[PDB]
C-alpha cells in the first residue's frame, strides 16, 4: 500500500512536472532529480519487461520524454499494429501540435529501416505534419527502389488530398527531380501528377451508373412556381444530374427556362455548370454554341453564368484557362464579368496565391459596389488559401467600416474567413481583438473565421465565446451564425453534438433553432447517428417556417446513403414526401426548402455522396468550403451552387495500369437485397459475389468496408491487403496472356 501510493503519487507528480516542463523547451528549465528518473524508469522498465502491449506507448506519451518510446518499439511484435495503435492513441488526445509533429517525424524513421516500408504510417503522418523535409526522401526513394506499382497508391492519395499548396510545391519538387530509367521515370512523374484519370474513371462509372425516375421530376413540374421555387427545381436537377452531363432533361423545351428575364436564368446556367464538369472542349464549345450568331446576347446572365459555370467546371484543374480569363475579364461589362467572372476566376485560381488576381481583384472591389465586392471577397478568400498576406487583412478590415453596404461586409467577411486556415497559434489575438467589434456582420466574421482555423477539435476555448455570444448577445445574427463554427470544430465526434445542441433544437428564438438545425445538418452529415434523427420530429412541426426549412435540410443531410432495413426512416421519408403535396397550404419558402431538401437525396442518383473527412482522417478543404458556402444560401441563394465541390463519390479502385482496365469481383458477407436501391413507384442470406465489376463500382457504405471478403480463387490480387475502402492498384499475379482489356466509350453527352 505504502510503496504503491508513493510510486503512484510519484508518477502522477512526475508526469505533472513533465507537463509543466513540456511546453517550455528552453529557458527557466526546472531541475529534475536523477533518483526520480531512476525510480520511475525502474518500475517503468519492470512494466517494459513484456510491455503488456497496452501501456508502452501510453505511459511513453504521458511522460513527454524524447527517447522513452524508441526502446519500446525495439522488442515488440506486430510493428504496424504498434504504430497504428500509437497514432490512433495520439490522434485521440487533443494534441497541441507542439509534440505530435516531433513524435511522428521520429516514428517515421523506423519503417524505412525495416524490410519493407508501410503506407498507412506515411499517409497518417503526412496528413498532419505537412513538412517538406519528410517527403523529399520518399519522393527520391521511388527511383532507387525501381518499383512502379507501389508508388501509384501513395502518389494517387497524396495528390488526391491532405494538401493544396504543399502539392503546388511538391509538383515542382518532383518536376526538378529527373531529366530537365530515363524513359520510364519521365512517364512516371508526368502521369502521377496528372490527376485527370480520376475524373475520367468517375465520368465513366458515373456515366454508366445513373438512375433517373419520372416521378421526382414530374412532381417538381407539378409543384413548380414561376417566382421562388423555379431555382429550386433547377438546383435539384443540377443535384441529380451532377457529373452525368445529362442535358437531355433540359432539352425537352426552352419555354420553361428562359420564360423570365431575372436571376433564375443565371441560376439555371450555373446549375448547368453543376450538371457537367471536367471538360476542356465541350464546356467552352457548349457555352459558345448556344448563340453563335450575333455575339450579343439579350440576356447577359447567359454570359455571366458561362463564366461562373466555367469556373465550376475548371475547379482545381491543371489545365486552367485562367490566362484567357484575364483577357476576357479585361472587357468592360455590366456586373456579369465582375460578379460571375470574379467567382469563376477566383474558384479556378483557388490556392494559387497569385498576386495578379490579387491586384485585379482589388481594382475590381475598388468601385465600392456590394455585388462585385461580395464576389471579390468570395474569390479572394479562395485564392488566398494559406497565403496570409500582411496588408490584405488590414486592407479588408480597413475597407469594411468605410462603407455602408452589407453585401460588401459579408463578402469580405467570408473573404477574411476562408483565408484563415492553420493559424491556430496565430489568429488568437486577431480573432479575440475582432470579436469586440461594433459591427454584427464582422462579429459573425470572427466566428466564421475561427471556424476553419480550429478544425479538428483542437481548441476547447473558442466554444466559450461561441456559445457565450450565442446566448449573451441580443442580435440574432451572431446567434444563428454562431454554432456553425461549433459544428465545424466538433465535426469529429457525431455523438457528442446532439447532447449539447439538443437544448438549441427548441431554443428561445427561432434563429438559434435555425442555426442549430444547420449545426445538426453539418455535424451528423454522412454518419448514421440517430441522436439527431429522433430529434427531427419536433423540429419539423412549428408555426415558424425557419425551423421547418432548416429541419428539412438537416433531415435531408442525414438520410443520404442509408438503407431502410437498418433504421426506420419511413417517418421522415413520408413527412418529407408530404411537403410537396402540402405546399398549397404551406409557406412559399417552406416548399422551396422542401423540394430543395428533396433534391439532396436524389443527388447523382444515390451514387455520389458527401464526406467531411478523408479515409486517413484528414478533412477536405473544398468539402468544408462547399458545405459552409452551401449554408450561406440564406443571404444569397445562388451561392448554393458550390455544393458540387463537396461531392465525394464512394467506390473502390482496382486500376492496375493507366491504360489497362481489369475486372475485380469480390464478395460481401451481408445480404445483397439489403444493399439494393429503393426503387420508387412506377407512375407512368449471403451473396455469391459483389456487383462491382470492370474495375463500374457502385455506392458503398463506410460500414460495408468491414464485411468485404476477397475471393481466394481470384486470378489477380494486389500487393497490399485490401482492408478498408480507398484508392489502390492491382498487382498482376499471373503475369501472362489474357489480361481482359475492355474498350472505351464513345462520343455523346460527355467528350
Amino acid at each position: 500500500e505504502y510503496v504503491e501510493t508513493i510510486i503512484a503519487k510519484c508518477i502522477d507528480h512526475y508526469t505533472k512536472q513533465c507537463v509543466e516542463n513540456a511546453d517550455l523547451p528552453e529557458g527557466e528549465k526546472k531541475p529534475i532529480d536523477q533518483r526520480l528518473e531512476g525510480i520511475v524508469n525502474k518500475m517503468f522498465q519492470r512494466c517494459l519487461d513484456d510491455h503488456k502491449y497496452k501501456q508502452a506507448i501510453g505511459i511513453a506519451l504521458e511522460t513527454r520524454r524524447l527517447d522513452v518510446f524508441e526502446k519500446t518499439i525495439l522488442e515488440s511484435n506486430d510493428v504496424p499494429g504498434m504504430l497504428a495503435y500509437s497514432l490512433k492513441l495520439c490522434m485521440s488526445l487533443m494534441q497541441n501540435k507542439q509534440f505530435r509533429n516531433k513524435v511522428l517525424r521520429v516514428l517515421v524513421k523506423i519503417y524505412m529501416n525495416l524490410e519493407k516500408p508501410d503506407f498507412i504510417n506515411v499517409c497518417q503522418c503526412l496528413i498532419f505534419l505537412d513538412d517538406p523535409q519528410a517527403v523529399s526522401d520518399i519522393l527520391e526513394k521511388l527511383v532507387k527502389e525501381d518499383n512502379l506499382l507501389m508508388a501509384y497508391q501513395i502518389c494517387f492519395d497524396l495528390y488526391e488530398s491532405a494538401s493544396q499548396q504543399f502539392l503546388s510545391s511538391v509538383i515542382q519538387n518532383l518536376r526538378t527531380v529527373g531529366t530537365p530509367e530515363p524513359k520510364d521515370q519521365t512517364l512516371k512523374m508526368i502521369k502521377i501528377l496528372s490527376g485527370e484519370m480520376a475524373i475520367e474513371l468517375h465520368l465513366q462509372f458515373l456515366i454508366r451508373n445513373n438512375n433517373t425516375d419520372l416521378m421526382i421530376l414530374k412532381n417538381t413540374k407539378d409543384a413548380v412556381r414561376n417566382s421562388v421555387c423555379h431555382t429550386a427545381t433547377v438546383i435539384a436537377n443540377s443535384f441529380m444530374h451532377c457529373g452525368t452531363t445529362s442535358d437531355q432533361f433540359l432539352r425537352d423545351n426552352l419555354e420553361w427556362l428562359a420564360r423570365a428575364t431575372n436571376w433564375a436564368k443565371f441560376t439555371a446556367t450555373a446549375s448547368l455548370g453543376v450538371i457537367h464538369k471536367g471538360h476542356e472542349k465541350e464546356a467552352l464549345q457548349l457555352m459558345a454554341t448556344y448563340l453563335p450568331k450575333d455575339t450579343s446576347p439579350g440576356s447577359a446572365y447567359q454570359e455571366g453564368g458561362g463564366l461562373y459555370a466555367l469556373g465550376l467546371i475548371h475547379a482545381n484543374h491543371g489545365g486552367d484557362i485562367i490566362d484567357y480569363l484575364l483577357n476576357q475579364l479585361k472587357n468592360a461589362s455590366n456586373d456579369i464579368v465582375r460578379h460571375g467572372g470574379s467567382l469563376g476566376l477566383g474558384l479556378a485560381a483557388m490556392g494559387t496565391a497569385r498576386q495578379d488576381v490579387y491586384d485585379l481583384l482589388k481594382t475590381n472591389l475598388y468601385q465600392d459596389d456590394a455585388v462585385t465586392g461580395e464576389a471579390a471577397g468570395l474569390a479572394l478568400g479562395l485564392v488566398m488559401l494559406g497565403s496570409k498576406n500582411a496588408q490584405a487583412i488590414e486592407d479588408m478590415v480597413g475597407y469594411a467600416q468605410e462603407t455602408q453596404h452589407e453585401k460588401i461586409l459579408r463578402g469580405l467577411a467570408v473573404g477574411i474567413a476562408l483565408v484563415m486556415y492553420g493559424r491556430m497559434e496565430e489568429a488568437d489575438a486577431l480573432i479575440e481583438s475582432l470579436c469586440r467589434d461594433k459591427d454584427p456582420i464582422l462579429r459573425r466574421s470572427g466566428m466564421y473565421t475561427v471556424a476553419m482555423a480550429y478544425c479538428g477539435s483542437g481548441n476547447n476555448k473558442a466554444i466559450r465565446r461561441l456559445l457565450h455570444v450565442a446566448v449573451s448577445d441580443v442580435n440574432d445574427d451572431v446567434r444563428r451564425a454562431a454554432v456553425e463554427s461549433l459544428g465545424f470544430i466538433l465535426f469529429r465526434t457525431p455523438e457528442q453534438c446532439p447532447s449539447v445542441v439538443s437544448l438549441l433544437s427548441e431554443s428561445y428564438n427561432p434563429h438559434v433553432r435555425y442555426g442549430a438545425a444547420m449545426a445538426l445538418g453539418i455535424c451528423c452529415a454522412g454518419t448514421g447517428n440517430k441522436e439527431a434523427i429522433n430529434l427531427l420530429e419536433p423540429m419539423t412541426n412549428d408555426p415558424v417556417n425557419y425551423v421547418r426549412q432548416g429541419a428539412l435540410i438537416a433531415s435531408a443531410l442525414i438520410m443520404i446513403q442509408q438503407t431502410e432495413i437498418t433504421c426506420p426512416k419511413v417517418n421522415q421519408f413520408r413527412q418529407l414526401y408530404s411537403k410537396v403535396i402540402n405546399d398549397k397550404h404551406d409557406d412559399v419558402m417552406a416548399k422551396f426548402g422542401a423540394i430543395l431538401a428533396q433534391g439532396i437525396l436524389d443527388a447523382g442518383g444515390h451514387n455520389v455522396t458527401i464526406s467531411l473527412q478523408s479515409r486517413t482522417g484528414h478533412t477536405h478543404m473544398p468539402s468544408v468550403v462547399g458545405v459552409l458556402v452551401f449554408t450561406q444560401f440564406w443571404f444569397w441563394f445562388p451561392l448554393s451552387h458550390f455544393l458540387s465541390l463537396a461531392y465525394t463519390p464512394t467506390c473502390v479502385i482496382g486500376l492496375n495500369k493507366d491504360l489497362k482496365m481489369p475486372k475485380v469481383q469480390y464478395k460481401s458477407n451481408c445480404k445483397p437485397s439489403t444493399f439494393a436501391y429503393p426503387a420508387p413507384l412506377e407512375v407512368p442470406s449471403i451473396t455469391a459475389k459483389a456487383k462491382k465489376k470492370e474495375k463500374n463500382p457502385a455506392r458503398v457504405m463506410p460500414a460495408q468496408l468491414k464485411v468485404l471478403t476477397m475471393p481466394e480463387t481470384c486470378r489477380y490480387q494486389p500487393f497490399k491487403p485490401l482492408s478498408i475502402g480507398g484508392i489502390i492498384i492491382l498487382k498482376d499475379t499471373s503475369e501472362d496472356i489474357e489480361e481482359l482489356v475492355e474498350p472505351v466509350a464513345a462520343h455523346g453527352p460527355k467528350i
Binding site: 504503491e4 518500475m43 513484456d50 437544448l503 427548441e506 428561445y508
Partner: protein, 49 residues
C-alpha cells in the same frame, strides 16, 4: 509485474471515481438543462403570448 493489475488497477479505480465526478457533472448538466428547458418553455410561452 503486478503493476497493470495493481498500480494501474488502482489508477483505473481512481479513473472510475473520476467517472463518478463526471456523473455529478453529468447529472448536474442533465437537471440544469431540464430546468433550462422549463425556463425556456415558459419564456417561449409568454413569447407565444
Amino acid at each position: 509485474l503486478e503493476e497493470g493489475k495493481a498500480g494501474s488497477g488502482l489508477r483505473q479505480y481512481y479513473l472510475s471515481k473520476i467517472e463518478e465526478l463526471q456523473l455529478i457533472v453529468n447529472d448536474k448538466s442533465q437537471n440544469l438543462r431540464r430546468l433550462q428547458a422549463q425556463r425556456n418553455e415558459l419564456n417561449a410561452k409568454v413569447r407565444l403570448l
